[PDB]
Amino acid sequence: VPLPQLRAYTVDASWLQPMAPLQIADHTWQIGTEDLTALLVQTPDGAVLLDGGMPQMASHLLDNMKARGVTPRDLRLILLSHAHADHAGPVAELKRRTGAKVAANAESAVLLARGGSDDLHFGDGITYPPANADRIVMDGEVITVGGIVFTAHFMAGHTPGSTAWTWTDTRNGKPVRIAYADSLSAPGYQLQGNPRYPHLIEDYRRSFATVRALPCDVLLTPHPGASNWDYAAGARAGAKALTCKAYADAAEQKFDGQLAKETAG
Amino acid sequence: VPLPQLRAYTVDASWLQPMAPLQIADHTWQIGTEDLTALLVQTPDGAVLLDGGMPQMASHLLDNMKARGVTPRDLRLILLSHAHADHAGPVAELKRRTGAKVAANAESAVLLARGGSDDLHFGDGITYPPANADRIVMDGEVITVGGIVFTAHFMAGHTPGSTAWTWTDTRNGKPVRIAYADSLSAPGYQLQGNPRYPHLIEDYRRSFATVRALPCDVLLTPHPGASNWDYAAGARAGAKALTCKAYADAAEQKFDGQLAKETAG
Amino acid sequence: VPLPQLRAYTVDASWLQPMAPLQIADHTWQIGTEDLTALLVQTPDGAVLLDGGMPQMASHLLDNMKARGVTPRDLRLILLSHAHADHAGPVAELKRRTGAKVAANAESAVLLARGGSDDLHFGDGITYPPANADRIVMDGEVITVGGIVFTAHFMAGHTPGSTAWTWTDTRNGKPVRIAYADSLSAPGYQLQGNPRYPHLIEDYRRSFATVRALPCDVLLTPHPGASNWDYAAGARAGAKALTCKAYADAAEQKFDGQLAKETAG
Amino acid sequence: VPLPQLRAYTVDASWLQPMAPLQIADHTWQIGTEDLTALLVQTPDGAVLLDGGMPQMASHLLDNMKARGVTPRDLRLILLSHAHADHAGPVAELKRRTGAKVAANAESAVLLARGGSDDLHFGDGITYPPANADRIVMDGEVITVGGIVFTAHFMAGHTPGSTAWTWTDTRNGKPVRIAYADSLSAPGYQLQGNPRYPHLIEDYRRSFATVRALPCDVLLTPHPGASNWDYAAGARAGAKALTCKAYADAAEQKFDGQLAKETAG
Ligand SMILES: C[C@@H]1[C@H]([C@H](C(=O)O)[C@@H](C)O)N=C(C(=O)O)[C@H]1S[C@@H]1CN[C@H](CNS(N)(=O)=O)C1
Ligand SMILES: C[C@@H]1[C@H]([C@H](C(=O)O)[C@@H](C)O)N=C(C(=O)O)[C@H]1S[C@@H]1CN[C@H](CNS(N)(=O)=O)C1
Ligand SMILES: C[C@@H]1[C@H]([C@H](C(=O)O)[C@@H](C)O)N=C(C(=O)O)[C@H]1S[C@@H]1CN[C@H](CNS(N)(=O)=O)C1
Ligand SMILES: C[C@@H]1[C@H]([C@H](C(=O)O)[C@@H](C)O)N=C(C(=O)O)[C@H]1S[C@@H]1CN[C@H](CNS(N)(=O)=O)C1
Ligand SMILES: [Cl-]
Ligand SMILES: [Cl-]
Ligand SMILES: [Cl-]
Ligand SMILES: [Cl-]
Ligand SMILES: [Zn+2]
Ligand SMILES: [Zn+2]
Ligand SMILES: [Zn+2]
Ligand SMILES: [Zn+2]
Ligand SMILES: [Zn+2]
Ligand SMILES: [Zn+2]
Ligand SMILES: [Zn+2]
Ligand SMILES: [Zn+2]
């Protein structure tokens, strides 16, 4: 009886289904797949990418950038929700193929630099090519690209370094406060008395309150389903989107249910 | 007119004045200099070092370890208060010369890995040889060596990764709850509206409350003067030591004064 | 049509088939699998591991170490042939679970730290958890553990950082010069005019000459088949082993054939 | 008697004396100080910087770049001769303040990432802010920016990762093959039987032959004096410059003399 083969990180096909760029606001586009968010924000001073999805999405992202008039040298900055393989997967390759630099908090930078290995909950089960951050950000710090101001809001829980990114774009000339809020799930996590994350519950509870209070005319999430987006629905892709308040409340109710089930288990 | 020469990080002589090991508790010793703490905790399962002081202290620390019966292979773990040159200075060299592995939180690990460069407040003015952490710890996580349990208590402010380490040793057979609380100073820092540390004030205030509540029969600090230790006073070195409550209260009063002076400046 | 799923690095079952420790010399043991070498050298001053095989082999290696009387704290040093997933796979996890430090040359250290990603020939197709080296070695440098002297002999080609490690053990009291020579294969490589490795051919040719001249009473290789070892053959496992001269000559003949086939292709 | 203060890395004033850009060829400029080379190559596709000199030179380099019409975003690539503090000093800060990415060989990348600490010959005596390489290059590999092709020629000795960079620019319309050859000095080095660099002598001898054979209409060196440049001499700054052949021969004669003196010492 040999040791088991390594198991590839396989996902639902919709997570890997390419889509053409979908406009969210005047200068903000969804350029990932049907079920994984990768946001391109285009400024006169270069482009920002928030998340890249899975490791195998790099070429697709570059194709969609080209379709939008963003060449590899024009990509200046990569920001991340959190450093798991299904959101930061292609960052190392993107850095090699573009001018982009990565800004992230210390927790996300440490996890990215180990390619998602030694995860607090997944171990080495879900890894990806490691990448280095070029700039470390603190909670509430802003990064400004072409007069678009991105604010980091730490919302630890799903990962220690989970971050919501907020900025203001326009839509029909009017300002739109966009909130890219990270995942608030705890998939298979041990929540209570976890020796690798002793204050997990307290961090999640603080993160629900953080998300509830974000400036949030439009909420987007790394898994669009979490905020009720349907990237395949065209002109109605965002019609059913949740508010940040509703997203936080739904995540807290689910979390409270998981806590109760863990106590019973 | 040439550019200025690089300026060495020079310190008061007492900070560099070697001392013989000073016993703090049954298995805990001060082995640094007169004015910089470096704590050696000896267990049947190897030795732990908390801080090393300045970069040039490595050989002295190794001498004091040998005097205590700790060879290079017996040093198993290095913990840090914070990753500035006067506390983590010799860690890289210690790792090369001993069996020791470094455990630190993500913020301290990132700063250590850049040798203290790009400091939020000091820039590149105070650097030291970079070192890599071998284990990343979360707030409240414990590390157990030979039945001595070290608990990390994050107290961000002086640096983002500032940590208090607590453990229980014995003294005349009775348990002694030791608290190695990090610095609570803000030397020359811009406190209000600091773009590199937007929530600095909130973090300091939370850290005062954290220090005030630590299990703390005996408080030690990286600069012994901060907790009223006098490592040169022999059998009375710890006689005047502050409680954790008094240390936090003194640090908060000083901080409030600095805030008021900054507003006036 | 979605993007392809990630493909796991799957291997022949014999590569993953655990075996009990097989004694090579008085203090040198094969403790990996039937078809992947992982050498444990036991000294009074701690144990050295040369290679670990595939990522999923860590627990098996630790079991075999325990069977040999080597606890996790007794493992002092990990050396590598080259930093591909089937030889350095479990190094990150071994470092987390033992006292071991990694010594490697700069090329191997860079590849290990990126977990085998951005490989000159494999791209990101064959990755593993990244690890950091604790000591960088130069060509011909020696590392001495308990009076066993390990000499590094660089033999670039299969990877830039490919290394042969030599040491002298005993067998029936007599000295035995052991040569752990790295792979000399070029599996699917573009050999001529490779922009990522312009001097590939020259390096391979120099490496054949290096291997031919190693001190080599007993040759071992990361894939035992390359040196005609059969780890499942018990008391005759090493009976058919090649000399270093024969191994180099066979590798050069195969390489010359591949060159000719590449020219024709 | 306290431990000694840290000693700053101080240098001759001419090494820190700013100069205005000095044109070497149509698109190649010396933009460092009077006695430290920092070469700016301007292409329609961005600028390349080869070396930056001392750590405190970053702002001066950026000023000279601006004077040349190169903004921070236009700097695309930093190449290095070798990763000592007087040549790679300001690279970390340049990466933070510009769009530049660093390409270097593995040896130079490892030394840069430790900020010059644990030097084979200097120990920790000469350190600088650590930086990460974005691309690793192999011997003979080319990097092309705006149709300027830079070729790496490894010339190990002064450091393991010492590199000569060659490219072709124009001067009065005619092609000029420029050779930026690294230092061939061994200042205070133990040459024979050095355990940290066993093949030092062989590497230096191979490097003399490499430099002698470089394409070399114009030779430049990190210390301009080594190639008989006088950056303060205006229109005659390069008039007395050595050929690559003469530079190698002078370095070999000096090296042979040092070998003989070491034997006598
Ligand atoms: C297990 C999911 C996956 C993992 C993760 O990011 O933790 C990844 C390692 O596989 N991404 C998820 C995340 O929350 O970031 C978790 S939760 C899962 C993702 N979407 C599934 C269906 N719900 S939804 N809201 O998108 O319609 C639930
Ligand atoms: C400027 C001091 C120094 C610096 C630091 O750690 O920030 C170091 C970069 O120089 N270490 C300090 C610390 O708090 O950790 C600061 S505060 C300074 C240290 N001890 C001085 C005298 N007070 S005491 N309490 O020790 O008697 C004040
Ligand atoms: C493609 C093989 C594998 C790869 C490698 O190390 O390059 C790994 C990424 O899959 N390990 C090999 C090595 O040489 O190190 C190559 S060669 C292959 C290994 N053993 C196979 C059968 N020959 S043998 N000599 O062992 O009987 C050939
Ligand atoms: C000791 C010098 C210095 C050191 C170095 O790069 O090794 C640095 C750590 O201080 N830079 C040098 C180099 O070669 O790269 C060495 S040699 C020294 C530099 N220029 C001095 C005068 N000779 S010259 N040829 O420039 O007129 C000799
Ligand atoms: Cl481009
Ligand atoms: Cl020892
Ligand atoms: Cl153990
Ligand atoms: Cl700019
Ligand atoms: Zn996730
Ligand atoms: Zn996810
Ligand atoms: Zn400090
Ligand atoms: Zn201090
Ligand atoms: Zn291989
Ligand atoms: Zn292999
Ligand atoms: Zn040098
Ligand atoms: Zn120099």
Residue numbers in the entry:
A (entry chain A), B (entry chain A), C (entry chain A), D (entry chain A): 3 to 267
Excerpt from the publication:
L1 is a dizinc subclass B3 metallo-β-lactamase (MBL) that hydrolyzes most β-lactam antibiotics and is a key resistance determinant in the Gram-negative pathogen Stenotrophomonas maltophilia, an important cause of nosocomial infections in immunocompromised patients. We describe kinetic studies and crystal structures of L1 in complex with hydrolyzed β-lactams from the penam (mecillinam), cephem (cefoxitin/cefmetazole), and carbapenem (tebipenem, doripenem, and panipenem) classes. Despite differences in their structures, all the β-lactam-derived products hydrogen bond to Tyr33, Ser221, and Ser225 and are stabilized by interactions with a conserved hydrophobic pocket.
1 and S1) are directed toward the solvent and do not interact with the protein main chain, consistent with similar catalytic efficiencies across the carbapenem class. The tebipenem- and doripenem-derived products bind almost identically, with the C-6 carboxylate (formed on opening of the β-lactam ring) bridging the Zn ions, apparently replacing the catalytic water/hydroxide. The pyrroline C-3 carboxylate interacts with Zn2 and with the side chain oxygen atoms of Ser221 and Ser225; the pyrroline N further interacts with Zn2. Boronates bind to NDM-1 similar to the products of 1β-methyl-carbapenems to L1 (binding mode 1), including interactions with Zn2 and displacement of the Zn-bridging hydroxide by the boronate oxygen, together with a concomitant increase in the Zn – Zn distance.
